[PDB]
Design a protein around this ligand. Structure first.
Ligand SMILES: Cc1cc2nc3c(=O)[nH]c(=O)nc-3n(C[C@H](O)[C@H](O)[C@H](O)COP(=O)(O)OP(=O)(O)OC[C@H]3O[C@@H](n4cnc5c(N)ncnc54)[C@H](O)[C@@H]3O)c2cc1C
Ligand SMILES: [Cl-]
Ligand SMILES: [Mg+2]
Ligand SMILES: [Mg+2]
Length: 496
DNA sequence: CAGCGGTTGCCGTG
DNA sequence: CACGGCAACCGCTG
C-alpha cells in the first residue's frame, strides 16, 4: 500500500506541480501538508509584516478550496518540521514524501533533516525541480562548475541548454482523501488560521490577494494585451503608476509559487512565436524571468550571499554605522517626499515598482546615506509580500554597486527622478496624505515652499512633515568620493 | 593577447 | 541629441 505526503513550502499551486503528481500515483491516501510554526512571530530578533503573512494564508485558503473541490483537503499541521514529520510518518503509515526542491540556505538544512528523518521511518523522498525554470545545479555544471556572473553569458548558456521544461500535467480531478480517524489529520486541528488568530493586532492594508486562482487570473490579465507582452521593455515602465501598476505584479505569486515560472515562460514563447519583432533579454518580460533565474543560480552557489563579509562576489565597502539615517529612511521620514512615499507604499502594500526600489535603495546606500545594503535588505525582508531571499540580496548588491553593477556615479536624484513620470505628484499625494494639498511646484521639494504655501496646504515642514535629512548635492558627492576610495582599496588588495 | 557591451543617472553645455 | 564630468568598472571572450 502507498501512503504519501505532498509537502507545501513554496509551490502553493496545483498546476505545474510534479511533486504533487508523483505523490498521487498508485496512492491509497495523500496527505497535503503545510507546516506552520505557531511560535514564529514570538522569535523577537526578526519581524514579519501582516501583509506578507496574510498573503500566505490567503494562498493556503485557496489551496484548501482547490482540494475540497477534489474530495481531499489541506492539512495545516502546527509545529516545526523536524518534530511534526516523525510522528505523522509513523501515525499515517507513510511510504512516500514529495515536495518541490528549494535551493535557499535554510531550506537545505531543513530538507537535509527531513530526508534523514524520512530514511529512519522507511520513507521514500522525491523532490522535483519546479520553482525555478531550470535545475540550477545543472545550469552551473553546464557552464563548467561556476554560475555565470553576467546576464549576457547567462542568456547564451540557457539558449545552449534549450527551453525550460514544460509545465507539468494538471493533477487528478478527484484525489484520495486522507485516512479517517488519524488524530493529526483532524479538521479542528488542521484549519487555515486568520491573521487575527495568529496574533496580529493591526489589519493588512495591501491590495493584492494571495492564491493560485488570483495568480492565474492576474496571469490572464497580463496576456489580455499580447502586443504589450511582446513589446515589454522593463526600463520604459512607470514607477508612479499605482492604480494600474506598470509591470505584471506577478512577483508575490512567483515567490510563493502560486504561479509556475515554467507556465509563464511557456506562455511567453507562445506569444513570441506569433510576434517575431518582440523584445529580447535583458529588458523583455522573459528577460525578467531570467533575471530571477540568474540570481537564483549565482545566489545558491555563492557562500554568504546575503552578506558583505566573506562573499566572493561582493565588494568590501566602508559603509557607515548610522542609526539616525537608517531609522529615518526606514520610517519614511527622510524629508524627501518621493522616497518617503515609496517607503510608505512598502509598508502599506508590501510592493513597489522596481524603479521605486532603485530610488530608495540607492538613497540608503551609495546615493545619500552610505548605509549598508544589508540593513536595507532587512527592512524589505520585513515588509515585501514578494520578498525573496536571493532576489532581495542580489538586487541590494546591484543597487549599492557592490556586485553585478559598478557604475556608482549613476546616482538617482530623490527630487528629479519621479518628477519626470509624475510631475503633479499623484503618487506622493496617494501615499503621503499630509502633502495632498501642497502645490505641484513644491511637492517634491517642500522645504523650498514659502511658509504661506505650507500653511495654506496644511503642511508645515518641521511640524506636519520632516525637513530633508541631507542636502542631496552635498551628500551624493560625498558618497561618490567614498565609493571611489573604496574601489581603489579593493583594487590594491586584488594584486596579492 | 585586450576589447565589447552592460535591465533603469544626471547636470551643464553647446 | 549628445558630449564630458563624475572617476577611472569588469566578466567574458579561444
Ligand atoms: C533593492 C531591491 C530589492 C528587490 N527585492 C525583490 C524581492 O525581494 N523579491 C522580488 O521578487 N523582486 C525583488 N526586486 C525586483 C523587482 O523590483 C521586482 O521583482 C519587480 O518589481 C516585481 O514586479 P513585477 O512582478 O511586476 O515584475 P515584472 O517586470 O512584471 O517581471 C516579471 C517577473 O520577473 C522577475 N523579476 C523582475 N525584476 C527582477 C529583478 N530585478 N530581479 C529578479 N527577478 C526579477 C519577478 O519574479 C517578476 O514577477 C528587487 C529590486 C530591488 C532594486
Ligand atoms: Cl555620456
Ligand atoms: Mg561596444
Ligand atoms: Mg543644468
Amino acid at each position: 500500500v502507498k501512503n504519501s505526503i505532498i509537502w507545501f513550502r513554496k509551490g502553493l499551486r496545483l498546476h505545474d506541480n510534479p511533486a504533487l503528481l508523483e505523490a498521487c500515483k498508485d496512492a491509497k491516501h495523500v496527505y497535503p501538508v503545510f507546516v506552520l510554526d505557531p511560535h514564529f512571530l514570538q522569535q523577537s530578533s526578526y519581524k514579519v509584516s501582516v501583509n506578507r503573512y496574510n498573503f500566505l494564508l490567503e494562498s493556503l485558503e485557496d489551496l484548501q478550496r482547490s482540494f475540497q473541490a477534489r474530495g481531499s483537503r489541506l492539512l495545516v499541521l502546527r509545529g516545526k518540521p523536524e518534530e511534526v514529520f516523525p510522528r505523522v510518518f509513523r501515525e499515517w503509515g507513510v511510504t512516500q514524501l514529495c515536495f518541490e526542491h528549494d535551493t535557499e540556505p535554510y531550506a537545505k538544512v531543513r530538507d537535509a533533516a527531513v530526508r534523514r528523518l524520512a530514511a529512519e521511518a522507511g520513507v521514500e523522498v522525491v523532490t522535483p525541480i519546479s520553482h525555478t525554470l531550470y535545475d540550477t545545479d545543472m545550469l552551473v555544471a553546464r557552464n563548467g562548475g561556476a554560475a555565470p556572473l553576467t546576464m549576457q553569458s547567462f542568456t547564451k548558456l540557457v539558449d545552449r541548454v534549450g527551453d525550460p521544461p514544460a509545465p507539468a500535467p494538471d493533477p487528478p480531478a478527484a484525489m484520495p482523501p486522507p485516512a479517517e480517524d488519524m488524530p493529526s489529520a483532524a479538521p479542528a486541528a488542521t484549519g487555515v488560521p486568520t491573521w487575527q488568530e495568529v496574533g496580529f493586532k493591526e489589519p493588512p492594508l495591501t491590495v493584492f490577494k494571495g492564491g493560485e486562482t488570483e495568480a492565474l487570473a492576474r496571469l490572464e490579465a497580463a496576456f489580455q494585451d499580447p502586443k504589450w507582452v511582446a513589446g515589454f521593455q522593463k526600463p520604459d515602465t512607470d514607477p508612479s503608476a499605482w492604480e494600474k501598476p506598470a509591470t505584471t505584479v506577478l512577483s508575490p505569486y512567483l515567490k510563493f509559487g502560486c504561479l509556475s515560472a515554467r507556465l509563464f515562460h511557456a506562455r511567453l514563447l507562445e506569444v513570441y512565436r506569433r510576434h517575431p519583432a518582440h523584445s529580447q533579454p535583458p529588458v523583455s518580460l522573459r528577460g525578467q524571468l531570467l533575471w530571477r533565474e540568474f540570481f537564483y543560480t549565482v545566489g545558491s552557489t555563492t557562500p554568504n550571499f546575503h552578506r558583505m563579509a566573506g562573499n566572493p562576489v561582493c565588494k568590501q565597502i566602508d559603509w557607515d554605522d548610522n542609526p539616525e539615517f537608517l531609522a529615518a529612511w526606514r520610517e519614511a521620514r527622510t524629508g524627501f517626499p518621493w522616497i518617503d512615499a515609496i517607503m510608505t507604499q512598502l509598508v502599506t502594500w508590501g510592493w513597489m515598482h522596481h524603479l521605486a526600489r532603485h530610488s530608495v535603495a540607492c538613497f540608503l546606500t551609495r546615493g545619500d546615506l552610505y548605509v549598508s545594503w544589508e540593513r536595507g535588505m532587512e527592512v524589505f525582508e520585513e515588509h515585501l509580500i514578494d520578498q525573496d531571499h536571493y532576489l532581495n540580496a542580489a538586487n541590494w548588491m546591484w543597487l549599492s554597486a557592490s556586485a553585478f553593477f559598478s557604475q556608482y556615479f549613476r546616482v538617482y536624484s530623490p527630487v528629479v527622478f519621479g518628477k519626470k513620470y509624475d510631475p503633479e505628484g499623484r503618487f506622493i499625494r496617494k501615499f503621503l496624505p499630509v502633502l495632498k494639498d501642497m502645490p505641484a511646484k513644491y511637492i517634491y521639494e517642500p522645504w523650498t515652499a514659502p511658509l504661506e504655501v505650507q500653511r495654506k496646504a496644511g503642511c508645515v515642514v518641521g511640524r506636519d512633515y520632516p525637513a530633508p535629512i541631507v542636502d542631496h548635492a552635498v551628500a551624493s558627492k560625498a558618497c561618490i568620493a567614498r565609493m571611489a576610495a573604496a574601489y581603489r582599496r579593493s583594487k590594491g588588495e586584488k594584486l596579492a
